[PDB]
């Protein structure tokens, strides 16, 4: 089986850039396939057969190389070219690169915050779960911070990242905070505090049980 | 040319695989019909092919217990795995020739435990926009799909991944709207989860 080794693992990119994008082989290759994954979409043919473009994609991109080394070229990088990017050959064992995630560079955005008590629904089941959404911001490091009552909260907090949005460059995040309805129903305020590079005051969002 | 997955998510151990693609808009008796399968990190995996006059090729570490065939009379063709293992839990997808176009894949999942349909709790509350959300709690196993409004807000949607818990997933779901759209006009999330072939609609109350 034939290694393609793709560097580096991440890159990234400002609007208008033209990067290259590289796919290092085991052995001596023929031809290069290069393929285009963004979120939520199944992964779409970009150039075949080392330069040859597709259908259905811009003059922009553009593959270059022979034997053990080839190149992905895209230019004018736009947000849109936000995705994973794999290198193929083909022989009597055809694999994939590992891949090269694109990430976009954009100015610094500040997470709009919205804070959401637990359903009716689920309280009768017994559950209490505290979501807080923060959407769109950059750069993707924050820290969220769940206080009960004043005193803030560690254990039970669930945090999940979207993939960098194709449209502003920007990503989102959503912290679950579970408890039991009897540990929910113990306290009366609830807050989430999001702490983003943006701003040395804290976001913050809460309710109170009452 | 549009091609689509279908089968069954979840295959015990020891058992075998089965999937088929449905392709319209170009004929199987033409070109390269691939399989091809993807693990969590970023790795992808040929599987194999039948092309137009029949004639199958496999991946060599594959080929011992793979098999492809096709229905021509209903343009086609199948993919058969056996003896599976947690090691063949992935993403499986179907590829025309030189993997142009592909369908929209399906996440078989290899285990012996049950299908659990998951709980589908609203996340509701001034501004001129406001978000709303859905919270998919205690399901097995992946994946679920959750739209808004049959795909009439796309735009404003943010899909939060799955995560993990005591065995269980839980993902969420939000949704951005002119404070005008809701509650004037109904708001719902449609949460499904072909595992357990259950679909949970969820309208979204001020």
Redesign the interface.
Known sequence: ?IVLTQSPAIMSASLGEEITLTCSASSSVNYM?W?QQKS?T????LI?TTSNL??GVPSRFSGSGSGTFYSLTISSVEAEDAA?Y?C?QWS?????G??T?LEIKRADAAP?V?I?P??S??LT?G?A?V?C?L?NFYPKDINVKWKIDGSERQNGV?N???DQDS?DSTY???S?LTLTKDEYERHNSYTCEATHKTSTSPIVKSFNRN | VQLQESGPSLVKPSQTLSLTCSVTGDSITSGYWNWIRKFPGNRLEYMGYINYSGNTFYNPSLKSRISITRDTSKNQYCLQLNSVTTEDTATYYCATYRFNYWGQGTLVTVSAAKTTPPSVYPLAPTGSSVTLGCLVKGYFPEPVTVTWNSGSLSSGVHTFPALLQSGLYTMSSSVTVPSSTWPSQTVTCSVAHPASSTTVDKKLEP
């Open positions: 089986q396939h393929y939520g199944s992964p779409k043919l075949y597709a259908s994973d794999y193929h009597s064992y055809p694999t994939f590992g891949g995630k709009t919205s959401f637990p359903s629904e689920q089941s559950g779960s979501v959404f959407n669930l999940s990242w979207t449209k989102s995040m959503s679950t």
